[PDB]
């Protein structure tokens, strides 16, 4: 029931790789510091989102077995998860404990960042649904890896190969859940339940960037490739 030695090695390795990410405080200190125009915020979004993809590619290449997968399946997994991984990381940063009234301010800042009204509620409803589960850093790290190695994506040719890589991560995560929350025997299942709501953010990701309240929507070549914009 307790993490095996193989599971403890897997977990610590996923944690190290996950830890190579931009410090949350860097992101929130800036948003809180002062109010920016919808234009300055659109630019902050594109630079953060370009850096997020670059780090995600490095995190993914380190996942045990990912490099043994067919090359075309490797691109399909990365392309299929990149936007979901971005919102999951945004949800993590959003629910990090801040000084009194700071998350209120962070929330007011994001609300008036330039994003369209139609996307506000679903986004904050998702970030809130995430904050309700009170996830640990190990849970965020494992859930990101599970999101990336989803064998039920589109354009995946060899699904059973992906399943084989995702299963040990699900098993470690399940054990952590049955420890971090013995009183919530539904914790593992709700974490998996959130993954379904996250897929809904895929439906309109391109439109979320396009409807931002700016006169022009300039993106980087890499973002154009990942999000489905030009």
């Amino acid at each position: 029931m307790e993490l095996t030695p193989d599971q403890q090695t897997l977990l610590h390795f996923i944690m190290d790789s996950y830890n190579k990410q931009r410090m949350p405080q860097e992101i929130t200190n800036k948003i809180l510091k002062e109010a920016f125009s919808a234009e300055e915020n659109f630019l902050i979004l594109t630079e953060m989102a370009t850096n997020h993809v670059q780090v995600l590619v490095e995190f993914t290449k380190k996942l045990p077995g990912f490099q043994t997968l067919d090359h075309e399946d490797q691109i399909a997994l990365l392309k299929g998860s990149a936007v979901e991984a971005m919102f999951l990381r945004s949800a993590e940063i959003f629910n990090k404990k801040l000084p009194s009234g700071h998350s209120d301010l962070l929330e007011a800042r994001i609300r008036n960042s330039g994003i369209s009204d139609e996307y506000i509620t679903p986004m904050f409803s998702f970030y809130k649904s995430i904050g309700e589960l009170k996830m640990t850093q190990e849970e965020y790290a494992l859930l990101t890896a599970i999101v990336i190695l989803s064998p039920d994506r589109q354009y995946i040719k060899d699904r059973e190969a992906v399943e084989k890589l995702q299963e040990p991560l699900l098993d470690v995560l399940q054990k952590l859940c049955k420890i971090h929350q013995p009183e919530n025997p539904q914790h593992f299942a709700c974490l998996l339940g959130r993954l379904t709501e996250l897929r809904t953010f895929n439906h309109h990701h391109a439109e979320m960037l396009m409807s931002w309240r700016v006169n022009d929507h300039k993106f980087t070549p890499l973002l154009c490739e990942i999000w489905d914009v030009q």
Binding site: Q54, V57, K61, H71, I75, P221, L222, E225, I226
Partner: peptide, 13 residues
């Protein structure tokens, strides 16, 4: 091609 940059980041190193 279609995911030229993504293919590069994955195939470098």
């Amino acid at each position: 091609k279609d995911h030229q940059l993504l293919r590069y980041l994955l195939d470098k190193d």
